[PDB]
Amino acid sequence: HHWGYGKHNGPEHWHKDFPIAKGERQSPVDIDTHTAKYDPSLKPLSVSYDQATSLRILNNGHAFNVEFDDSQDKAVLKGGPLDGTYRLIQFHFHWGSLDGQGSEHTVDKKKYAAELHLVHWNTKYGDFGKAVQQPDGLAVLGIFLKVGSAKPGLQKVVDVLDSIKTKGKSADFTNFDPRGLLPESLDYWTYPGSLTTPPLLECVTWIVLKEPISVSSEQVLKFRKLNFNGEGEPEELMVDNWRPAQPLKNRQIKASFK
Ligand SMILES: CC(C)c1ccccc1-c1ccc(S(N)(=O)=O)cc1
Ligand SMILES: [Zn+2]
């Protein structure tokens, strides 16, 4: 009886195995655009993905992860609210069963169709496992998806999904360029928070881009063909793998833009 997103093991149940679920800096949150304050001391974000080395794509039973070689400073996030250098380790998405839901963060209570998480760890902690034990261990770049025009840079991901339909399946996934997943503007909101899946550790500086990317209906439909179950199990479509907004508590969301 492990955690998931079903009727009986979903977000409202997680606190029983992971008490930090009701903690002081949990994610995601609703971004109230009128209450977020412009912080003129925030730097432009530095996204350096030109040397990114993707390796593999994995269905882990709750999302799919596109994994990167993070044994050197090849793809890094710096600047913005961050001190130091954060290495890209993986990206994944959260999405809905319908276009009206799927994102984890919300913007004035608006839910997007999906949300991309580019996960980075602080190199001062040496590796990912140590980093998640630190309050400034991770930087996650969050990007909203809306349904409209196709995102050409997403298509290579969409097309490999039939090869990783079920839990525990992986496929080689080299030479994927995550720059093709970025919107034009790097304007962002930022706040201190947590992993949005168990173990829900409070180790994340969240940087959520204001500008969503557009993906096509066909692209998101292919996400919804994935399975939470393993091969040879009853099919449970991988949809609605998002945690809802959590209480903001004693936190201020800062904006990089006026
Ligand atoms: C399960 C978690 C510790 C983990 C392990 C290995 C690689 C990635 C992650 C991880 C899981 C979720 C997130 S998230 N949803 O971006 O907050 C970010 C990172
Ligand atoms: Zn995520």
Side-chain angles (χ1 to χ4, degrees), residues 231-253:
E231 179 180 12
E233 294 167 7
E235 188 184 50
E236 185 60 351
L237 296 176
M238 183 180 282
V239 296
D240 296 315
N241 56 356
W242 50 275
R243 187 191 195 191
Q246 302 302 303
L248 188 59
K249 256 71 190 294
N250 191 39
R251 294 176 286 181
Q252 289 185 324
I253 300 174

Short mmCIF file of all heavy atoms in Angstrom, two decimals, residues 231-254, unseen atoms left out:
data_model
loop_
_atom_site.label_atom_id
_atom_site.label_comp_id
_atom_site.label_asym_id
_atom_site.label_seq_id
_atom_site.Cartn_x
_atom_site.Cartn_y
_atom_site.Cartn_z
N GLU A 231 3.84 -3.75 -16.24
CA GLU A 231 3.44 -4.60 -17.35
C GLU A 231 2.76 -5.85 -16.81
O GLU A 231 3.18 -6.41 -15.80
CB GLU A 231 4.68 -4.98 -18.16
CG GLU A 231 4.41 -5.89 -19.34
CD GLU A 231 5.66 -6.24 -20.12
OE1 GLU A 231 6.79 -5.96 -19.63
OE2 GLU A 231 5.51 -6.80 -21.22
N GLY A 232 1.69 -6.26 -17.48
CA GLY A 232 0.91 -7.42 -17.05
C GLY A 232 0.06 -7.16 -15.81
O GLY A 232 -0.33 -8.11 -15.12
N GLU A 233 -0.21 -5.89 -15.51
CA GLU A 233 -1.16 -5.52 -14.46
C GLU A 233 -2.36 -4.81 -15.08
O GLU A 233 -2.29 -4.37 -16.23
CB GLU A 233 -0.50 -4.64 -13.41
CG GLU A 233 0.57 -5.37 -12.61
CD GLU A 233 1.44 -4.45 -11.78
OE1 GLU A 233 1.17 -3.23 -11.68
OE2 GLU A 233 2.42 -4.97 -11.20
N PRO A 234 -3.49 -4.73 -14.34
CA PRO A 234 -4.66 -4.03 -14.86
C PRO A 234 -4.28 -2.58 -15.17
O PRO A 234 -3.56 -1.96 -14.39
CB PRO A 234 -5.65 -4.07 -13.70
CG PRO A 234 -5.27 -5.28 -12.91
CD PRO A 234 -3.77 -5.35 -13.02
N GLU A 235 -4.76 -2.07 -16.30
CA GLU A 235 -4.32 -0.77 -16.74
C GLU A 235 -4.93 0.33 -15.89
O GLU A 235 -6.15 0.40 -15.70
CB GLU A 235 -4.63 -0.54 -18.23
CG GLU A 235 -3.98 0.75 -18.73
CD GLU A 235 -4.32 1.12 -20.16
OE1 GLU A 235 -5.52 1.13 -20.52
OE2 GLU A 235 -3.39 1.44 -20.91
N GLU A 236 -4.07 1.19 -15.37
CA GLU A 236 -4.50 2.40 -14.72
C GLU A 236 -3.74 3.53 -15.39
O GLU A 236 -2.50 3.60 -15.32
CB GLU A 236 -4.27 2.35 -13.20
CG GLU A 236 -4.82 3.56 -12.43
CD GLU A 236 -6.34 3.79 -12.54
OE1 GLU A 236 -7.05 3.14 -13.36
OE2 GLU A 236 -6.85 4.67 -11.81
N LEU A 237 -4.47 4.36 -16.13
CA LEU A 237 -3.83 5.41 -16.89
C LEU A 237 -3.09 6.37 -15.97
O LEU A 237 -3.60 6.74 -14.90
CB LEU A 237 -4.85 6.19 -17.73
CG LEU A 237 -5.56 5.38 -18.81
CD1 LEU A 237 -6.61 6.26 -19.47
CD2 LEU A 237 -4.60 4.79 -19.84
N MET A 238 -1.89 6.77 -16.40
CA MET A 238 -1.11 7.74 -15.65
C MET A 238 -1.66 9.13 -15.98
O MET A 238 -1.27 9.76 -16.97
CB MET A 238 0.38 7.62 -15.99
CG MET A 238 1.26 8.59 -15.19
SD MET A 238 3.01 8.44 -15.60
CE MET A 238 3.45 6.94 -14.71
N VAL A 239 -2.63 9.56 -15.17
CA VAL A 239 -3.24 10.91 -15.30
C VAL A 239 -3.44 11.46 -13.88
O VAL A 239 -3.57 10.70 -12.92
CB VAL A 239 -4.59 10.93 -16.06
CG1 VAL A 239 -4.39 10.49 -17.52
CG2 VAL A 239 -5.64 10.06 -15.37
N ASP A 240 -3.50 12.78 -13.77
CA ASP A 240 -3.75 13.44 -12.49
C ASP A 240 -2.71 13.06 -11.46
O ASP A 240 -3.00 12.80 -10.29
CB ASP A 240 -5.20 13.24 -11.98
CG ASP A 240 -6.24 13.88 -12.90
OD1 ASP A 240 -6.02 15.03 -13.34
OD2 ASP A 240 -7.26 13.23 -13.22
N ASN A 241 -1.45 13.08 -11.90
CA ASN A 241 -0.34 12.86 -10.99
C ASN A 241 0.22 14.18 -10.44
O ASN A 241 1.43 14.43 -10.50
CB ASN A 241 0.76 12.08 -11.70
CG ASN A 241 1.24 12.73 -12.98
OD1 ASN A 241 0.73 13.75 -13.42
ND2 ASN A 241 2.30 12.16 -13.55
N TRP A 242 -0.67 15.01 -9.93
CA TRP A 242 -0.35 16.32 -9.37
C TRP A 242 -0.83 16.39 -7.93
O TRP A 242 -1.89 15.87 -7.58
CB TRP A 242 -0.98 17.45 -10.21
CG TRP A 242 -2.46 17.31 -10.52
CD1 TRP A 242 -3.01 16.61 -11.55
CD2 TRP A 242 -3.54 17.95 -9.84
NE1 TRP A 242 -4.39 16.75 -11.53
CE2 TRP A 242 -4.73 17.57 -10.49
CE3 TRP A 242 -3.61 18.82 -8.74
CZ2 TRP A 242 -6.01 18.01 -10.06
CZ3 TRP A 242 -4.88 19.26 -8.32
CH2 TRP A 242 -6.05 18.85 -8.99
N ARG A 243 -0.01 17.03 -7.10
CA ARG A 243 -0.41 17.37 -5.74
C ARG A 243 -1.07 18.75 -5.78
O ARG A 243 -0.59 19.63 -6.48
CB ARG A 243 0.83 17.42 -4.85
CG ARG A 243 0.50 17.62 -3.38
CD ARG A 243 1.73 17.93 -2.53
NE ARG A 243 1.40 17.74 -1.11
CZ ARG A 243 2.17 18.12 -0.08
NH1 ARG A 243 3.31 18.78 -0.28
NH2 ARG A 243 1.78 17.85 1.17
N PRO A 244 -2.19 18.94 -5.06
CA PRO A 244 -2.84 20.26 -5.07
C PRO A 244 -2.08 21.29 -4.22
O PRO A 244 -1.18 20.93 -3.44
CB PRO A 244 -4.22 19.99 -4.46
CG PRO A 244 -4.03 18.78 -3.62
CD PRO A 244 -2.96 17.96 -4.27
N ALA A 245 -2.47 22.55 -4.39
CA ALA A 245 -1.87 23.65 -3.64
C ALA A 245 -1.95 23.42 -2.13
O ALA A 245 -2.97 22.96 -1.59
CB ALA A 245 -2.51 24.97 -4.04
N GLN A 246 -0.84 23.74 -1.46
CA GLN A 246 -0.68 23.63 -0.01
C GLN A 246 -0.65 25.01 0.65
O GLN A 246 -0.37 26.02 -0.03
CB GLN A 246 0.60 22.88 0.31
CG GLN A 246 0.67 21.47 -0.29
CD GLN A 246 -0.48 20.61 0.18
OE1 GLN A 246 -0.68 20.41 1.39
NE2 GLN A 246 -1.25 20.09 -0.77
N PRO A 247 -0.91 25.08 1.97
CA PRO A 247 -0.94 26.38 2.64
C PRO A 247 0.38 27.13 2.55
O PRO A 247 1.45 26.55 2.75
CB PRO A 247 -1.25 26.02 4.09
CG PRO A 247 -1.95 24.70 4.01
CD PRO A 247 -1.24 23.98 2.90
N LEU A 248 0.29 28.42 2.22
CA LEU A 248 1.47 29.26 2.06
C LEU A 248 2.17 29.46 3.40
O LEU A 248 3.40 29.58 3.45
CB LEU A 248 1.09 30.60 1.42
CG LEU A 248 2.26 31.51 1.03
CD1 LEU A 248 3.18 30.83 0.02
CD2 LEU A 248 1.67 32.77 0.44
N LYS A 249 1.39 29.51 4.49
CA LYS A 249 1.96 29.71 5.83
C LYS A 249 2.81 30.98 5.86
O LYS A 249 2.43 32.00 5.27
CB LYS A 249 2.77 28.49 6.30
CG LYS A 249 2.08 27.62 7.33
CD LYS A 249 0.92 26.85 6.73
CE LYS A 249 0.09 26.17 7.80
NZ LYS A 249 0.83 25.11 8.53
N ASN A 250 3.95 30.92 6.52
CA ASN A 250 4.79 32.08 6.69
C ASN A 250 5.79 32.25 5.57
O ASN A 250 7.00 32.15 5.81
CB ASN A 250 5.54 31.98 8.03
CG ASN A 250 6.24 33.27 8.42
OD1 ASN A 250 5.70 34.36 8.21
ND2 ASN A 250 7.45 33.16 8.96
N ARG A 251 5.28 32.47 4.35
CA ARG A 251 6.14 32.64 3.17
C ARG A 251 5.67 33.75 2.25
O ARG A 251 4.47 33.99 2.12
CB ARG A 251 6.25 31.35 2.34
CG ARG A 251 6.97 30.23 3.08
CD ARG A 251 6.95 28.97 2.22
NE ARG A 251 5.62 28.34 2.20
CZ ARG A 251 5.35 27.21 1.54
NH1 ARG A 251 6.31 26.61 0.82
NH2 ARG A 251 4.13 26.67 1.58
N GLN A 252 6.62 34.40 1.60
CA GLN A 252 6.31 35.43 0.63
C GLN A 252 6.82 34.94 -0.71
O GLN A 252 7.95 34.45 -0.82
CB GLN A 252 6.97 36.76 1.01
CG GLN A 252 6.33 37.44 2.22
CD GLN A 252 6.91 38.81 2.52
OE1 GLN A 252 8.10 39.05 2.33
NE2 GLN A 252 6.05 39.74 2.98
N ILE A 253 5.96 35.05 -1.72
CA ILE A 253 6.37 34.77 -3.09
C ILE A 253 6.91 36.08 -3.69
O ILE A 253 6.26 37.13 -3.59
CB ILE A 253 5.21 34.20 -3.91
CG1 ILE A 253 4.69 32.89 -3.27
CG2 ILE A 253 5.61 33.99 -5.37
CD1 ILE A 253 3.45 32.34 -3.93
N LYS A 254 8.11 36.00 -4.26
CA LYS A 254 8.77 37.17 -4.86
C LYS A 254 8.72 37.08 -6.37
O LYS A 254 8.81 35.98 -6.92
CB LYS A 254 10.23 37.25 -4.39
CG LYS A 254 10.41 37.52 -2.90
CD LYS A 254 9.68 38.79 -2.49
#
